[PDB]
């Protein structure tokens, strides 16, 4: 049937319950390298607006404190026009947010996204997309991968090596079967800390819609889009589905 | 347990194989100590009020009551036989009430000082009295209006009117409204028709109505005149007490006094099994129908269901042809047939037509409005010999026949989940059709039932007991909400003006009193009921209660329950449950008490299924379930679906007139409770129910052509986009029509979208003041906007889930175009006090106009 | 200091329901033999509240001036502004900007002695130090048809 989504849409209502089980990938703390702090409220919301099956992604912007130049607090999650799939997501370009208020000296720290396959390393659609977005622009951009599954969510932060990037540049496209040249060693654990003592916020497209699944013709993947602070829409929000209200 | 019914002298029983019939002769003339009061003896204005009654004088009952009615101002209770002439009796009391205001010397008649209310049990009859009273009281230039069937704010106006004809419930809601207290003061005549409804499970409405007129008046001090109109039944004594009628004004008329005097007959079917019992009644029915026809008389058959009418009518049709069929076709083949068969063809659609060709009609709701009006009018005109009816005819219409047969008295109570016997008031309503008073020398009423029941219906042609406990919790809350209860002594006083109370004192064993002799006038019992009631209310957060202290307090949630007439239990569910979703709302909507009785009847079910599978919002519920009907109906109203069945089309109408203020009550709760997403969705449903759409509002101007909107709806250009253009040529270019482009623009120009700016000022740490400046400029409307367009203003949290302040703005033609300012304070929660959020939101939504919402961020 | 909030009232100066509570407080003052003054945002509101207070006082056991009615008529004779005569008579004083000093002092004195139990005072005349036991501020909004809105009192 067409209505695969109906079942998923009902599912996403209980997606808030997955946040009684929040797991963060940890290893030995190294003060020689960075630590990324993700405000807990942003996580809670970002999951609440995600799908159970289809990938959902955003950029993260943040900045260092004075106390430690290596503690990068994430301040803002910028949700942008995009077209999700199972196991991959097509994302529009790094947003221009320069002209918004309170954006004084934010760094683009990277991206954050859902997935339905728990791994210990960045996968091949991840590496393709990570290179697509950041290859020629900002190499240190991390990837925060969220493994979201019934019961729980599990966060995992990665850097990408230059071999990773190069390999990703080689792959303009990714197929289900080809799986050519891939390495789990392409990516490296990055230090992520979830904190509840700082609260971050969202920046959303000005049109308000971030989910161009049911509008896949109008999705401009190099679109010059506008943005504002604001509360992000849910994945199957009526506005992401003009078409279903036409049948009715 | 046996309570054998005394039958008048001359009564007798015949035993027939299929049914025991038992006979009650027409009664002898009474002692003639009266003169029929010819109209001409009435003062000369009135006389108009009685134009061309065939008699040109009042009938016996009316003449005897005329002194006290028209020359008296005393309260009155009139118990009389069925079909005794209630209108003119009501009329006499009306005219008297008018007399107290107009000057005898002055030509001029005061119209603002007096309000007359006429309570009547069913809309069918309420409408009828409105038509009749308008015609008759036309000459005095007074307005008679049905007190509005659906809405609430538009009641404040209907005091354009001098005679209000309501049902008990509509007048209960009206008069229970704190704001209507203004207008209850002008009500001088309160006519309650069918006052013996007191005994029905609807009767407490009449108790509440009266308890309120006497007891709650207080400082305003002048009680209206009351005239009860009743069936002759035991306890009329107690009833006249209940509505403070003194002996001057109490009347009881024996069957001797009944105009169009009624003959009764009771076929007591005796067959045990269903197949043969059903046959027994059909035969039994056929005989009586035949007899009535052989005497040149017409006849109305009451049956329990709508499918029954058509199958009973058919049995007859065929059984009449099985032997003769000449008898009912026509009065004369030459006279009738061309006049019948012309009319038989024209509006008749269903199997009804093959029946009408045979001179027998069917009549039920869920039948084409034109189709049932033919039935009434053909039967009225002699052309149909036999109308087969569902019970509604009895309350709705004024369509008499010489003979009326109740086939069967089995009825289905959905409330009781079970089959049951006809209530007494239904049987008495039905029998009020029997006997055409102007034409017929007399009338005939035939009940057909199981022998078990015959004794019972004999007695009827009944007891009355209070059900006030069952609805006690809901009804207590409403007085708590009206602020008349703060401590539980107010509650045990209140209960003293109930029927329950008068009835408990008098049969304490029935009502399970502990000990009347200890309790005296049941003071501890009252207090105990009140307690238990209050605790279950407190348990559910409709009230605040301290037993020890003894303070009763009114919650916002209880305040919704009272105002929207919602069951306390239902308020509980709404409390806990409100992740509520669109699909759920439609369900919850459909769960409303207001729609308790909605049932999916067999015939309409096929059509209903067609709509339930094209439904835009999923329905979890079955097509068996009533909830699915209400849901699919409401979805239809939003899509303005064309309906064939009359039954169902009435149903749907009933839904939209409530949908509005129910959906609002739902919205109000969610806004109070903070739930962003259902609050947002409810606001739309509310819009959707105003605008009758899920559509550019060029369709909302009655004065637009049908083609022009269709091109703009498909063209996907934003609605507001068309509004921006300030040039009359430009608007016409977008339409792609020249002449429609100049006419459209003036309408287009008038519509406007607010402008809002808002800064914030911290007064203290905790307290933020918000200063707002607003403008919209729109073309004035004498047709499109009314006197005002109201606008909800909310300030809500960043998530858009928590309403922090609200206020309603009413824009008026003097307000549009010019700027104004609003200020308010809101106290930041501790969370936000420590870390300010980035922004809040401030939003304005038209209560009336789709997609006129305008929201702006309010930065920290 | 007892502070009582009230729904949907930002829209106007005070509503029927608030007025009732003001009257309950003034009756409670009257019953404790304490004197109460009531503060209103306008002169109109003083007149209109007086009129409600007369009506409300009739419909209670306590409708007393606490003094005989023949003795009050010599005083009311001055009639500098007829509108004040009618209320003053029932035990209720009025103070607005622009009174005749006759009016002013005739009203003050009757309160001073204890003839009239209740004083009603414009927000403006709040300056005049007119001490009492109980105070009722009945509504805390001002209309200006400059910004076409109601504004709340400043502390």
Swiss-Prot record, chain A:
Domain of life: Eukaryota
Stretches assigned to the MPN domain: 35-164
Localization, UniProt: Nucleus
Other comments on record: Present with 468 molecules/cell in log phase SD medium.
UniProt function note: Functions as a scaffold that mediates the ordered assembly of spliceosomal proteins and snRNAs. Required for association of BRR2 with the spliceosomal U5 snRNP, and the subsequent assembly of the U4/U6-U5 tri-snRNP complex. Functions as a scaffold that positions spliceosomal U2, U5 and U6 snRNAs at splice sites on pre-mRNA substrates, so that splicing can occur. Interacts with both the 5' and the 3' splice site, as well as the branch region. Has a role in branch site-3' splice site selection. Associates with the branch site-3' splice 3'-exon region. Also has a role in cell cycle.
This protein's domain notes: The MPN (JAB/Mov34) domain has structural similarity with deubiquitinating enzymes, but lacks the residues that would bind the catalytic metal ion. Contains a region with structural similarity to reverse transcriptase, presenting the classical thumb, fingers and palm architecture, but lacks enzyme activity, since the essential metal-binding residues are not conserved.
Subunit structure, as described in the record: Component of the U4/U6-U5 tri-snRNP complex composed of the U4, U6 and U5 snRNAs and at least PRP3, PRP4, PRP6, PRP8, PRP18, PRP31, PRP38, SNU13, SNU23, SNU66, SNU114, SPP381, SMB1, SMD1, SMD2, SMD3, SMX2, SMX3, LSM2, LSM3, LSM4, LSM5, LSM6, LSM7, LSM8, BRR2 and DIB1.
Name recorded for this polypeptide: Pre-mRNA-splicing factor 8
Organism: Saccharomyces cerevisiae (strain ATCC 204508 / S288c)
Annotated gene: PRP8
Full protein stretch here: 2148 to 2395 of 2413
UniProtKB/Swiss-Prot annotation, chain C:
Subcellular location(s) of the protein: Nucleus
Subunit field text: Component of the U4/U6-U5 tri-snRNP complex composed of the U4, U6 and U5 snRNAs and at least PRP3, PRP4, PRP6, PRP8, PRP18, PRP31, PRP38, SNU13, SNU23, SNU66, SNU114, SPP381, SMB1, SMD1, SMD2, SMD3, SMX2, SMX3, LSM2, LSM3, LSM4, LSM5, LSM6, LSM7, LSM8, BRR2 and DIB1. Interaction with PRP8 is important for recruitment to the U4/U6-U5 tri-snRNP complex.
Function: RNA helicase that plays an essential role in pre-mRNA splicing as component of the U5 snRNP and U4/U6-U5 tri-snRNP complexes. Involved in spliceosome assembly, activation and disassembly. Mediates changes in the dynamic network of RNA-RNA interactions in the spliceosome. Catalyzes the ATP-dependent unwinding of U4/U6 RNA duplices, an essential step in the assembly of a catalytically active spliceosome.
Membership in a protein family: Belongs to the helicase family. SKI2 subfamily.
Miscellaneous comment in the UniProt entry for this protein: Present with 1440 molecules/cell in log phase SD medium.
Free-text comment about domains: Contains two helicase domains. The N-terminal helicase domain has catalytic activity by itself, contrary to the C-terminal helicase domain that may have a regulatory role and enhance the activity of the first helicase domain.
Protein name: Pre-mRNA-splicing helicase BRR2
Naturally occurring in which organism (per UniProt): Saccharomyces cerevisiae (strain ATCC 204508 / S288c) (Baker's yeast)
Residues shown, of full length: 1546 to 1700 of 2163
């Amino acid at each position: 049937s067409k209505n695969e989504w109906r079942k998923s849409a009902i599912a996403n209502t209980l997606l808030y319950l997955r946040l009684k089980n929040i797991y963060v990938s940890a290893d030995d703390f190294v003060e020689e390298q960075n630590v990324y702090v993700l405000p807990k409220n942003l996580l809670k919301k970002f999951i609440e607006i995600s799908d159970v099956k289809i990938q959902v992604a955003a950029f993260i912007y943040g900045m260092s404190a004075k106390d430690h130049p290596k503690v990068k607090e994430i301040k803002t999650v910028v949700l942008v026009p995009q077209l999700g799939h199972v196991g991959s997501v097509q994302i529009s370009n790094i947003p221009d947010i320069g002209d918004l208020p309170d954006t004084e000296g934010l760094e683009l720290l990277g991206w954050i996204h859902t997935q339905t396959e728990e791994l210990k390393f960045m996968a091949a659609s991840e590496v393709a997309t990570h290179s697509k977005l950041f290859a020629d622009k900002k190499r240190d951009c991390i990837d925060i991968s969220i493994f979201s599954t019934p019961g729980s969510v599990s966060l995992s932060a990665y850097n990408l090596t230059d071999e990773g990037y190069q390999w990703g540049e080689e792959n303009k496209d990714i197929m289900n079967v080809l799986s050519e040249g891939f390495e789990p060693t392409f990516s490296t654990h990055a230090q992520l800390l979830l904190s509840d003592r700082i609260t971050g916020n969202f920046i959303i497209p000005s049109g308000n819609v971030w989910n161009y699944t049911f509008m896949g013709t109008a999705f401009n993947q190099e679109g010059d889009y506008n943005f504002k602070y604001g509360i992000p829409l849910e994945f199957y929000n009526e506005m992401h589905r003009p078409v279903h209200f036409l049948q009715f | 347990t046996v309570t054998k019914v005394s039958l008048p002298e001359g009564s007798f029983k015949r035993v027939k194989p299929q049914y025991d019939e038992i006979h009650i002769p027409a009664p002898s003339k009474p002692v003639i100590d009266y003169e029929l009061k010819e109209i001409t003896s009435l003062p000369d204005w009135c006389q108009e009020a009685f134009p061309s009654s065939e008699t040109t004088s009042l009938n016996p009952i009316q003449s005897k009551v005329f002194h006290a009615a028209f020359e008296g101002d005393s309260n009155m209770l009139i118990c009389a036989p069925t079909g005794s002439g209630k209108t003119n009796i009501a009329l006499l009391t009306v005219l008297k009430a008018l007399s107290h205001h107009y000057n005898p010397k002055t030509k001029k008649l005061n119209l603002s000082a007096f309000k007359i209310v006429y309570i009547a049990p069913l809309k069918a009859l309420v409408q009828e009295q409105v038509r009749e009273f308008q015609r008759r009281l036309a000459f005095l230039g007074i307005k008679v209006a049905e007190l509005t069937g659906d809405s609430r704010l538009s009641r404040k106006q209907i005091d354009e009117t001098q005679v209000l004809v309501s049902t008990p419930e509509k007048w209960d809601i009206t008069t229970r409204n704190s704001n209507n207290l203004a207008i209850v003061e002008l009500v001088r005549l309160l006519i309650i028709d069918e006052i013996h409804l007191l005994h029905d499970d609807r009767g407490p409405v009449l108790e509440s109505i009266v308890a309120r007129t006497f007891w709650a008046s207080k400082y305003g001090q002048e009680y209206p005149r009351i005239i009860g109109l009743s069936a002759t039944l035991p306890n009329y004594e107690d009833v006249g007490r209940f509505l403070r009628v003194p002996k001057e004004g109490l009347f009881y008329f024996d069957s001797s006094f009944r105009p169009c005097p009624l003959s009764q007959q009771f076929c007591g079917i005796k067959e045990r099994n269903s197949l043969k019992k059903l046959k027994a009644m059909n035969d039994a029915c056929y005989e009586k129908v035949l007899e009535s026809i052989n005497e040149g008389n017409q006849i109305i058959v009451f049956v329990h269901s709508r499918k029954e009418t058509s199958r009973t009518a058919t049995w007859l049709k065929n059984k009449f042809a099985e032997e003769n069929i000449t008898h009912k076709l026509t009065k004369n083949d030459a006279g009738s047939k061309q006049i019948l068969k012309t009319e038989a063809a024209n509006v008749l659609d269903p199997s009804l037509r093959k029946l009408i060709e045979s001179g027998i009609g069917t009549h039920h709701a869920g039948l084409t409005r034109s189709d049932r009006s033919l039935s009434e009018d053909l039967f009225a005109d002699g052309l149909l010999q036999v109308l087969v009816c569902t019970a509604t005819l009895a309350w709705g219409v004024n369509l008499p026949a010489h003979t009326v047969i109740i086939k069967g008295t089995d009825v289905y109570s959905p409330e009781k989940g079970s089959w049951e016997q006809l209530s007494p008031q239904d049987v008495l309503q039905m029998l009020g059709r029997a006997g055409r008073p102007r034409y017929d020398t007399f009338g005939e009423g035939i009940i057909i039932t199981d022998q078990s029941n015959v004794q019972y219906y004999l007695s009827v042609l009944l007891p009355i007991e209070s059900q006030f406990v069952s609805k006690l919790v809901d009804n207590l809350n409403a007085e708590v909400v009206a602020g008349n209860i703060k401590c539980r002594n107010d509650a045990v006083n209140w209960l003293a003006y109930t029927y329950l109370y008068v009835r408990m004192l008098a049969s304490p064993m029935l009502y399970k009193v502990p000990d009347i002799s200890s309790d005296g006038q049941l003071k501890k019992f009252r207090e105990s009921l009140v307690h238990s009631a209050l605790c279950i209310l407190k348990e559910q957060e409709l009230v605040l209660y301290d037993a020890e202290n003894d303070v009763i307090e009114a919650t916002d949630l209880g305040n919704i329950a009272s105002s929207f007439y919602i069951n306390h239990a239902s308020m509980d569910v709404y409390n806990r449950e409100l992740h509520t979703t669109q699909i759920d709302l439609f369900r919850i909507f459909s769960m409303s008490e207001e729609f308790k009785y909605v049932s999916v009847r067999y015939e309409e079910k096929r059509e209903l299924k067609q709509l339930l599978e094209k439904a835009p919002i999923p329905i979890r519920e079955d097509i068996d379930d009533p909830l699915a009907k209400v849901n699919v109906l409401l979805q239809s109203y939003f899509s303005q679906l064309k309906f064939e069945g009359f039954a169902l089309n009435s149903d749907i109408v009933f839904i939209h007139q409530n949908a509005g203020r129910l959906l609002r009550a739902m919205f109000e709760i969610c806004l109070k409770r903070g739930w962003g997403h259902p609050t947002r969705m409810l606001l739309n449903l509310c819009k959707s129910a105003t605008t009758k759409m899920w559509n550019c509002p060029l369709r909302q101007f009655k004065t637009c052509p049908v083609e022009v909107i269709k091109r703009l709806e498909a063209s996907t250009v934003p609605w507001g986009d068309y509004l921006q253009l300030e040039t009359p040529a430009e608007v016409g270019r977008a339409i792609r029509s020249e002449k429609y482009g100049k006419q459209v623009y003036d309408l287009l120009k008038r519509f406007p979208k607010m402008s809002v700016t808002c800064n914030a000022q911290p007064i203290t740490r905790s307290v933020m003041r918000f200063n707002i400046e607003i403008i919209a400029d729109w073309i004035w409307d004498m047709n499109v906007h009314g006197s005002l367009e109201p606008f909800l203003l909310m300030l809500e949290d960043t998530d858009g889930d928590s309403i922090l302040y609200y206020d309603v703005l009413f824009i008026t033609p003097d307000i549009v175009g010019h700027e104004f300012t609003l200020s308010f304070t809101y106290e930041l929660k501790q969370h936000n006090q420590n870390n300010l959020p980035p922004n809040f939101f401030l939003t304005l939504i038209s209560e009336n106009w789709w997609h006129s919402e305008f929201e702006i961020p309010v930065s920290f | 200091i007892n502070i009582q909030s009230f729904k949907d009232v930002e829209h106007i100066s005070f509503n029927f329901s608030m007025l009732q509570m003001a009257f309950e407080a003034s009756a409670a003052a009257a019953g404790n033999r304490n004197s109460s003054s009531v503060f209103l945002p306008s002169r109109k509101d003083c007149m209109e509240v007086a009129s409600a207070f007369m009506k409300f006082s009739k419909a209670i056991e306590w409708d007393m001036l606490n003094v005989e009615e023949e003795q009050i008529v010599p005083y009311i004779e001055k009639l500098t502004d007829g509108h004040l005569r009618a209320p003053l008579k029932h035990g209720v004083g009025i103070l607005y900007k622009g009174m005749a000093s006759n009016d002013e002092r005739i009203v003050k004195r009757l309160y001073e002695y204890g003839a009239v139990s209740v004083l009603l005072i414009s927000k403006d005349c709040s300056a005049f130090a007119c001490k009492t036991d109980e105070v009722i501020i009945l509504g805390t909004n001002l209309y200006d048809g400059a910004e076409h809105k109601y504004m709340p009192y400043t502390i």
